[PDB]
């Protein structure tokens, strides 16, 4: 835990070779008090998130952590809200630009990498701080099938079978680990969230985004659609 000079204020190397500022940005992701779970199936990919509206006057329809990047790419953000929205906007811009110059839809792994590259710059440049959010992307690849990718504040990204983010990240990973060692995929995801939250939420308590092989277009399940999986 050594420290010298301004190695805890700006993104510079500390005595042990660590980047404290980047590590602090990972703690900022848990400040929102939410947890996200993405599960990759055999022919589908689902993203479940904790929908909390503790205010009553708030318009529940405007409260969501699931965003549509492209027609076939959806994502779930975790962490600082404002930072998340800017990253979602950046991803959308990157995706549209990719198609405009290359002639085809950007692959999920390429989009995730592009966002991670941008995040890396913040860990090397001292003038600006890293974003306090986490991005999880899901989409159907035409050659590889269902895809689940996640990048963070450190600029690190990877492909996953199933992965989580948020306050109960360590607990969601332990639940999904045993399961990996459509309907089941959606169920497993919801289960993982419910298991680590101990609440068994209703249809209006969570959000669901999915992409299947048959129906590649990113979709968001409604109250009646979420309840159906909850009743079973």
């Amino acid at each position: 835990g050594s420290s010298a000079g301004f190695d805890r204020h700006i993104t510079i190397f500390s005595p042990e070779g660590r980047l404290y500022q980047v590590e602090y940005a990972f703690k900022a992701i848990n400040q929102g008090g939410l947890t996200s779970v993405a599960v990759r199936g055999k022919d589908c990919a689902v993203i479940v998130t904790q929908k909390k509206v503790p205010d009553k006057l708030l318009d529940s329809s405007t409260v969501t952590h699931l965003f549509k990047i492209t027609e076939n790419i959806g994502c779930v953000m975790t962490g600082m809200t404002a930072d998340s929205r800017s990253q979602v906007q950046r991803a959308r811009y990157e995706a549209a630009n990719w198609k405009y110059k290359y002639g085809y839809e950007i692959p999920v792994d390429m989009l995730c990498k592009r966002i991670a590259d941008i995040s890396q710059v913040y860990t090397q440049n001292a003038e600006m701080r890293p974003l306090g959010c986490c991005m999880i992307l899901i989409g159907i690849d035409e050659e590889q099938g269902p895809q689940v990718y996640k990048c963070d504040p450190a600029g690190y990204y990877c492909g996953f079978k199933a992965t989580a983010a948020g306050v109960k990240q360590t607990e969601s990973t332990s639940f999904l680990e045993k399961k990996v060692k459509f309907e089941q995929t959606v169920e497993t995801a919801i289960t993982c969230l419910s298991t680590v939250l101990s609440i068994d939420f209703k249809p209006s308590e969570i959000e669901v985004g999915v992409v299947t092989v048959e129906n590649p277009k990113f979709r968001i399940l409604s109250e009646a659609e979420i309840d159906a999986h909850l009743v079973a």
Partner: protein, 226 residues
């Protein structure tokens, strides 16, 4: 952005930021490079934290050109930036000279990008060392580029976690006459010396470079070698 240097000389004449970037490298996962008579091998630990990480998704051993490949120890997202830069430098060279860039000319250009982040304004050095291998003029080449931007040509070396033990192991085992196929074995064995538990063909990654070019061994091939 800040226009003043974040790396500066201490009263002992050291550049601590670079010393600290090197600390990052030394805590990185292990990497090994061996230059055989008829090729070079690069081999690295890619143990993942869980079994949820799709190991096949991201690669630490990366091609730069038909004939050059890279591996690294230290900070993965810093590596990504370098890989992209080397790829752009190799293309730039090919567009001028219409011959694929010699390994040592790729190493000098990349190392130069590294030195600039020890002196330019507002930035920290790269928390990465590279091993670069290539084949050109019917000769195999292996180089290390560190965070200071210094480079060195090796017969064999190890970096990341447990490199000092690794090197001593390569002193004893390396010889010049050593063929590739054997080189590959002693690469994989240097990794074993510091590996946690049960080295599979999905938690190491291996690239080879020879006359045919540079390529990542397929997991199927790594298995045979294990």
């Amino acid at each position: 952005g800040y226009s003043f240097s974040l790396t500066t000389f201490s009263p002992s004449g050291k550049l601590v930021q670079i010393e600290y970037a090197l600390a990052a490298v030394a805590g990185g996962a292990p990497s090994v490079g061996i230059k055989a008579a008829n090729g070079v091998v690069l081999a690295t630990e890619k143990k993942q934290k869980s079994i949820l990480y799709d190991e096949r998704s991201v690669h630490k051993v990366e091609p730069i050109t038909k004939h050059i490949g890279l591996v690294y120890s230290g900070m993965g997202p810093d590596y990504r930036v370098l890989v992209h830069r080397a790829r752009k430098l190799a293309q730039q060279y090919y567009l001028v000279y219409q011959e694929p860039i010699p390994t040592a000319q790729l190493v000098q250009r990349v190392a130069s990008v590294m030195q600039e982040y020890t002196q330019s304004g507002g930035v920290r050095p790269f928390g990465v060392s590279l091993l670069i291998c290539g084949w050109n003029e019917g000769r195999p080449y292996l180089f290390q580029s560190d965070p200071s931007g210094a480079y060195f040509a090796w017969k064999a070396t190890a970096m990341g976690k447990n490199y000092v033990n690794g090197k001593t192991f390569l002193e004893k085992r390396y010889n010049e006459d050593l063929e590739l196929e054997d080189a590959i074995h002693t690469a994989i064995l240097t990794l074993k010396e510091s590996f946690e538990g049960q080295m599979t063909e999905d938690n190491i990654e291996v690239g080879i470079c020879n006359e045919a070019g540079f390529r990542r061994l397929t997991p199927t091939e790594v298995k045979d070698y294990l």
